[PDB]
Design an enzyme around this catalytic site. Structure first.
Site, PDB file in Angstrom:
ATOM      1  N   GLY A   1      -2.194  -4.815  -0.774  1.00  0.00           N
ATOM      2  CA  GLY A   1      -1.459  -3.767  -1.451  1.00  0.00           C
ATOM      3  C   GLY A   1      -2.194  -3.282  -2.688  1.00  0.00           C
ATOM      4  O   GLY A   1      -1.909  -2.210  -3.207  1.00  0.00           O
TER       5      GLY A   1
ATOM      6  N   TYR B   1       4.779   2.171   3.556  1.00  0.00           N
ATOM      7  CA  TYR B   1       6.162   2.007   3.094  1.00  0.00           C
ATOM      8  C   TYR B   1       7.114   2.869   3.908  1.00  0.00           C
ATOM      9  O   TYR B   1       7.123   4.091   3.755  1.00  0.00           O
ATOM     10  CB  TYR B   1       6.291   2.385   1.603  1.00  0.00           C
ATOM     11  CG  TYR B   1       5.645   1.428   0.613  1.00  0.00           C
ATOM     12  CD1 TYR B   1       6.258   0.229   0.278  1.00  0.00           C
ATOM     13  CD2 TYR B   1       4.422   1.731   0.008  1.00  0.00           C
ATOM     14  CE1 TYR B   1       5.684  -0.644  -0.627  1.00  0.00           C
ATOM     15  CE2 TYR B   1       3.830   0.857  -0.900  1.00  0.00           C
ATOM     16  CZ  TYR B   1       4.472  -0.333  -1.213  1.00  0.00           C
ATOM     17  OH  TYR B   1       3.926  -1.229  -2.112  1.00  0.00           O
TER      18      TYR B   1
ATOM     19  N   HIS C   1       8.461  -0.216 -13.014  1.00  0.00           N
ATOM     20  CA  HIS C   1       7.308  -1.108 -13.152  1.00  0.00           C
ATOM     21  C   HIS C   1       6.071  -0.315 -13.471  1.00  0.00           C
ATOM     22  O   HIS C   1       5.976   0.836 -13.088  1.00  0.00           O
ATOM     23  CB  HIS C   1       7.063  -1.866 -11.854  1.00  0.00           C
ATOM     24  CG  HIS C   1       6.639  -0.964 -10.742  1.00  0.00           C
ATOM     25  ND1 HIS C   1       7.529  -0.164 -10.055  1.00  0.00           N
ATOM     26  CD2 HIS C   1       5.408  -0.669 -10.255  1.00  0.00           C
ATOM     27  CE1 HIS C   1       6.867   0.571  -9.173  1.00  0.00           C
ATOM     28  NE2 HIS C   1       5.578   0.281  -9.274  1.00  0.00           N
TER      29      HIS C   1
ATOM     30  N   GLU D   1       1.790  -0.830 -12.632  1.00  0.00           N
ATOM     31  CA  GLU D   1       1.100  -1.453 -11.518  1.00  0.00           C
ATOM     32  C   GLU D   1       0.571  -2.805 -11.934  1.00  0.00           C
ATOM     33  O   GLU D   1       0.482  -3.107 -13.117  1.00  0.00           O
ATOM     34  CB  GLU D   1      -0.009  -0.549 -11.002  1.00  0.00           C
ATOM     35  CG  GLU D   1       0.507   0.779 -10.482  1.00  0.00           C
ATOM     36  CD  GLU D   1       1.474   0.628  -9.308  1.00  0.00           C
ATOM     37  OE1 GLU D   1       1.172  -0.130  -8.367  1.00  0.00           O
ATOM     38  OE2 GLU D   1       2.535   1.281  -9.318  1.00  0.00           O
TER      39      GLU D   1
ATOM     40  N   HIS E   1       7.125   3.618 -13.894  1.00  0.00           N
ATOM     41  CA  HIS E   1       7.732   4.553 -12.955  1.00  0.00           C
ATOM     42  C   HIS E   1       8.762   3.899 -12.024  1.00  0.00           C
ATOM     43  O   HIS E   1       8.832   2.672 -11.899  1.00  0.00           O
ATOM     44  CB  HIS E   1       6.654   5.282 -12.139  1.00  0.00           C
ATOM     45  CG  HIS E   1       5.708   4.378 -11.427  1.00  0.00           C
ATOM     46  ND1 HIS E   1       4.790   3.600 -12.091  1.00  0.00           N
ATOM     47  CD2 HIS E   1       5.505   4.152 -10.107  1.00  0.00           C
ATOM     48  CE1 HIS E   1       4.075   2.915 -11.213  1.00  0.00           C
ATOM     49  NE2 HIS E   1       4.481   3.241 -10.003  1.00  0.00           N
TER      50      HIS E   1
ATOM     51  N   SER F   1       0.043   3.564   0.197  1.00  0.00           N
ATOM     52  CA  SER F   1      -0.234   3.305  -1.215  1.00  0.00           C
ATOM     53  C   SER F   1      -1.279   2.207  -1.437  1.00  0.00           C
ATOM     54  O   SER F   1      -1.335   1.230  -0.686  1.00  0.00           O
ATOM     55  CB  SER F   1       1.073   2.924  -1.911  1.00  0.00           C
ATOM     56  OG  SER F   1       0.855   2.313  -3.166  1.00  0.00           O
TER      57      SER F   1
HETATM   58  O1  LIG Z   1       8.543   2.500  -2.939  1.00  0.00           O
HETATM   59  C1  LIG Z   1       7.394   3.103  -3.321  1.00  0.00           C
HETATM   60  O2  LIG Z   1       6.899   3.962  -2.597  1.00  0.00           O
HETATM   61  C2  LIG Z   1       6.772   2.696  -4.565  1.00  0.00           C
HETATM   62  C3  LIG Z   1       6.289   3.668  -5.417  1.00  0.00           C
HETATM   63  C4  LIG Z   1       5.488   3.223  -6.427  1.00  0.00           C
HETATM   64  N1  LIG Z   1       5.124   1.933  -6.594  1.00  0.00           N
HETATM   65  C5  LIG Z   1       5.634   0.991  -5.702  1.00  0.00           C
HETATM   66  C6  LIG Z   1       5.236  -0.402  -5.855  1.00  0.00           C
HETATM   67  C7  LIG Z   1       6.050  -1.439  -5.323  1.00  0.00           C
HETATM   68  C8  LIG Z   1       5.792  -2.776  -5.658  1.00  0.00           C
HETATM   69  N2  LIG Z   1       6.694  -3.825  -5.290  1.00  0.00           N
HETATM   70  C9  LIG Z   1       8.102  -3.791  -5.440  1.00  0.00           C
HETATM   71  O3  LIG Z   1       8.743  -2.813  -5.880  1.00  0.00           O
HETATM   72  C10 LIG Z   1       8.787  -5.040  -5.029  1.00  0.00           C
HETATM   73  C11 LIG Z   1      10.151  -5.219  -5.271  1.00  0.00           C
HETATM   74  C12 LIG Z   1      10.754  -6.442  -4.984  1.00  0.00           C
HETATM   75  C13 LIG Z   1       9.989  -7.477  -4.443  1.00  0.00           C
HETATM   76  O4  LIG Z   1      10.513  -8.688  -4.143  1.00  0.00           O
HETATM   77  C14 LIG Z   1       8.614  -7.307  -4.178  1.00  0.00           C
HETATM   78  C15 LIG Z   1       8.019  -6.077  -4.473  1.00  0.00           C
HETATM   79  C16 LIG Z   1       4.693  -3.097  -6.489  1.00  0.00           C
HETATM   80  C17 LIG Z   1       3.898  -2.091  -7.009  1.00  0.00           C
HETATM   81  C18 LIG Z   1       4.179  -0.745  -6.677  1.00  0.00           C
HETATM   82  O5  LIG Z   1       3.263   0.147  -7.040  1.00  0.00           O
HETATM   83  C19 LIG Z   1       6.525   1.350  -4.725  1.00  0.00           C
HETATM   84 MN   LIG Z   2       4.196   1.584  -8.683  1.00  0.00          MN
END
Ligand SMILES: O=C(O)c1ccnc(-c2cc(NC(=O)c3ccc(O)cc3)ccc2O)c1
Ligand SMILES: [Mn+2]
Ligand SMILES: [Zn+2]
Length: 345
Positions: free
Chosen positions: A162, A169, A180, A182, A268, A280
């Site tokens: 990732g 996704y 969060h 990154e 974001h 992603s």
């Molecule tokens: O859902 C999206 O498209 C999105 C958009 C932007 N960033 C993310 C994104 C998502 C994650 N992970 C998570 O949001 C996540 C939430 C709960 C968990 O137990 C494990 C992981 C870690 C970094 C990221 O950049 C997700």
């Molecule tokens: Mn993100």
């Protein structure tokens, strides 16, 4: 960019070919000050012929998002369900119990999102290793972007899923991602292959600390138990709540065929409008490195993405290597400065 607003870019085909230079270009335009920028590729471009093979593809670990909270402050718990396909998922996503509601303006859908966040827990097919790019696409290929983050696998063989590998996704109505930055406070890139929009909220890097102060006041037990509890990606905070406590933010809707680029320390969050699919990965530039060195990481669990900065500092900032390794590099980051690779502009 004095207002730190989210910019939109429409590169021509000639500008689109070199990825790192376009990233550098938009930072000379101050795009990075918003924490988030949208990029629309030329109409002449397409990463894959058709998305028809996909129905047989497997989602190894579907996640059911249960949300608890009230009054703009929510905590998201991720109950893991059992594997299923894209054909199965699209069935449940377009089902009458999970499908998108009808609406006039976007503002209407957004209200319905923040009002029904905690009812009918949807399924989110997140963290699915894979790409949907055809092998011959050589511009903005999320699989192989050729940025200095490639120095991590080149000098240690470590592939972090990732982060330096792509993720797919699959979302349905009301699936969301919490607040969060990154991992290692890196950049991210996000392409929406098809389907319904994905809406985003963003806080400019220069105000990220204000959001953290606010978050530690609202969740004091969590603050106390981890030096960076927001890296758990479990916290949702409504735009009204941010407004009420005077945190600057901006919002944007990403439609199929468009890129989002997030910048270092750019907090974001957002939600999916309906069935869709996005790819992603993270990436880096020379500007990222100092963020890399100062990023505060999760302190309370193992298997957290941690990256050794030693290789990066030795190669791109050798004059400070000895001060840093001795813990006397008291450099201070200025969130408005663009990356040095924009010396062309
Ligand atoms: O859902 C999206 O498209 C999105 C958009 C932007 N960033 C993310 C994104 C998502 C994650 N992970 C998570 O949001 C996540 C939430 C709960 C968990 O137990 C494990 C992981 C870690 C970094 C990221 O950049 C997700
Ligand atoms: Mn993100
Ligand atoms: Zn933690």
């Amino acid at each position: 960019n004095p207002s730190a607003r989210i910019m939109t870019f429409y590169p021509t085909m000639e500008e689109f070919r070199n990825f790192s230079r376009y990233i550098a270009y938009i930072e000379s335009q101050g795009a990075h000050r918003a924490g988030l920028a949208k990029v629309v590729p030329p109409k002449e471009w397409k990463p894959r012929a058709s998305y028809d093979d996909i129905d047989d593809l497997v989602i190894p670990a579907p996640i059911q998002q249960l949300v608890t909270g009230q009054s703009g402050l929510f905590t998201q718990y991720n109950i893991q369900k059992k594997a299923m396909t894209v054909r199965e998922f699209r069935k449940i996503a377009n089902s009458d119990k999970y499908c998108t509601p009808r609406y006039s303006e976007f503002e209407e859908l957004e209200r319905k999102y923040w009002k029904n966040l905690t009812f009918n827990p949807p399924i989110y097919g997140a963290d699915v290793n894979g790409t949907l790019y055809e092998k011959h696409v050589d511009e903005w290929n999320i699989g192989r972007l050729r940025t200095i983050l490639d120095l991590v696998e080149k000098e240690s063989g470590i592939t972090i899923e990732g982060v330096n590998t792509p993720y797919l996704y699959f979302g349905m109505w009301k699936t969301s991602f919490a607040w969060h930055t990154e991992d290692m406070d890196l950049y991210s890139i996000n392409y929406l292959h098809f389907g319904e929009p994905k809406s985003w909220y963003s806080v400019p890097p220069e105000h990220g600390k204000r959001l953290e102060r606010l978050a530690k006041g609202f969740f004091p037990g969590s603050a106390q138990s981890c030096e960076a509890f927001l890296r758990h990606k479990m916290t949702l905070i409504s735009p009204l709540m941010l407004k009420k406590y005077g945190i600057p933010f901006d919002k944007v809707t990403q439609e199929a065929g468009e890129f989002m680029i997030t910048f270092p320390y750019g907090y974001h969050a957002g939600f999916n409008h309906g069935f869709n699919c996005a790819e992603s990965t993270n990436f880096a530039t020379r500007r990222w490195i100092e963020y890399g060195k100062q990023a505060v990481l999760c302190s309370c669990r193992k298997d957290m993405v941690k990256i050794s900065m030693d290789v990066f500092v030795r190669k791109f900032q050798p004059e400070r290597y000895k001060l840093w390794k001795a813990g006397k590099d008291n450099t201070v980051i200025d969130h408005t400065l663009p990356t040095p690779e924009a010396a062309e502009f």
